[PDB]
């Protein structure tokens, strides 16, 4: 009956509304896993930089074009790469010669392209996030992968030719491959953080 919001994160994810919307029949069903780091104590966690991986599975040799939004708890501090980017490509994108991380406040937009279906399974992107000095036991800093769309452009996960199966794979990715308000996490830390639309987190065990 009461409405609950996360401490320092908003739910920007939108309803996947391209046809086909239902990706259940997709030949390729990609799933993106995000790091869930748990510290035993505040002292263990305070001021730590954590490598957060965004890892795809189930799509080896089956995608080429991607673009999705990542956001994180505003209390976390992002540690930029040597170029100033908030994210760094991983081995999953090694054969994709187009890859670009674009900074976006408490988040980043990450995209890739390839001249064939050279997308691979594994780590697509890493982001280093630093835990605040004043972190306390019980704290959860959620990390969200979100689908966004507007009439000018939208987020993507498709094959080189953007085929019918590419579009089915895309719908699967955004509706079943990641968490969102329509596919909520049941992870206890995310429930506690009131951020079940989110995907991973850095958490500190309860006292």
């Amino acid at each position: 009956h009461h409405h609950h919001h996360a401490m320092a994160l908003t739910d920007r994810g939108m309803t996947y509304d391209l046809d086909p919307k239902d990706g259940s029949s997709a030949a390729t069903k990609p799933v993106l896993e995000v790091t869930k780091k748990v510290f035993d104590t505040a002292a263990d966690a305070a001021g730590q930089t954590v490598t957060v991986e965004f890892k795809v599975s189930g799509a080896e040799g089956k995608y080429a074009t991607t673009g999705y939004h990542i956001y994180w708890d505003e209390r976390l501090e992002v540690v930029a790469t040597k170029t100033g980017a908030y994210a760094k490509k991983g081995a999953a994108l090694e054969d994709s010669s187009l890859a670009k991380a674009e900074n976006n406040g408490n988040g980043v937009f990450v995209a890739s392209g390839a001249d064939d279906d050279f997308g691979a399974d594994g780590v697509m992107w890493t982001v280093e996030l630093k835990v605040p000095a004043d972190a306390k036991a019980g704290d959860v800093y959620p990390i969200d992968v979100a689908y966004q769309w507007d009439p000018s452009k939208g987020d993507l996960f498709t094959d080189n030719k953007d085929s019918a199966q590419g579009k089915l794979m895309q719908a699967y990715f955004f509706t079943q491959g990641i968490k969102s308000s329509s596919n909520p996490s049941t992870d206890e830390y995310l429930v506690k953080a009131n951020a079940t639309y989110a995907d991973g987190y850095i958490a500190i065990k309860a006292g």
């Binding site: 074009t65 187009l98 674009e102 392209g113 452009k153």
Partner: protein, 236 residues
């Protein structure tokens, strides 16, 4: 009884070529108009006492070359462009002394133009990562032995349909060539084979897409994409 001559009708014949434009451009190029000849038809005759007009002869005066006098009036790419699925061609009326002209068949004389969004390789009225990939894919294909602009199609659009010699592939190339080393000296009339469509074009476009997708540049991309293109190509 008194015989006079008067213009009965007047029409133009025009030889013109296609022109490609970005939706942001403020001017069509009259260079599309190669030649325009104005024909003027006269009737000579009289009105009888019974008030009935009699025509004794029909003829034209010497046709006049008016090529240089033709304008497109107030029409511009920016004020003509409409995003419509699988539809990029427009017929732009020519003007002569601030009035339209009729062609030989009685219709307003027009010139064909194609107008699209810079970066929109696949011709779907959207600039996104798929356009970057298509551009990259074309570069990789044409960089392979035994392949070039003549055997490879650039655009995934159904309008091209895999056809390397489609005019829409020339149009797609024009839209995709966001990085032109030659500058203005390579004109909008260049064909796909005359352009360099490479990984630099593809990475710009991708960056345009990524910047459009974050809060800082969302509105710039939508409202004045040209300022964002300049940023992503290093020209500003």
């Amino acid at each position: 009884n008194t015989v006079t001559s008067a213009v009965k009708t007047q029409y133009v014949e025009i030889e013109s070529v296609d022109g490609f434009y970005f939706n942001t451009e403020d001017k069509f190029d009259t260079a599309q108009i190669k030649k325009a000849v104005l024909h003027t038809v006269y009737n000579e005759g009289y009105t009888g006492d019974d008030g009935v007009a009699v025509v004794l002869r029909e003829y034209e005066s010497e046709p006049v070359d008016i090529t240089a006098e033709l304008t497109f009036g107030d029409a511009t790419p920016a004020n003509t462009y409409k995003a419509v699925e699988n539809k990029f061609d427009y017929e732009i009326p020519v003007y002569y002394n601030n009035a339209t002209l009729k062609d030989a068949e009685g219709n307003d004389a027009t010139v064909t133009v194609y107008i699209g969004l810079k970066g929109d390789t696949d011709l779907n009225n959207i600039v996104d990562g798929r356009d970057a990939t298509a551009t990259l894919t074309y570069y990789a294909a044409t960089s392979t032995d035994g392949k070039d602009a003549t055997t490879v199609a650039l655009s995934p659009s159904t309008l091209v349909g895999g056809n390397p010699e489609s005019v829409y592939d020339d149009f797609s190339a024009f839209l995709s060539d966001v990085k032109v080393d030659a500058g203005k000296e390579l004109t909008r009339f260049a064909k796909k084979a005359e352009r360099l469509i490479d990984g630099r074009d593809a990475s710009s476009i991708l960056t345009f897409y990524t910047k459009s997708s974050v809060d800082q540049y969302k509105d710039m991309a939508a409202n004045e994409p040209n300022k964002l293109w300049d940023i992503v190509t290093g020209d500003a």
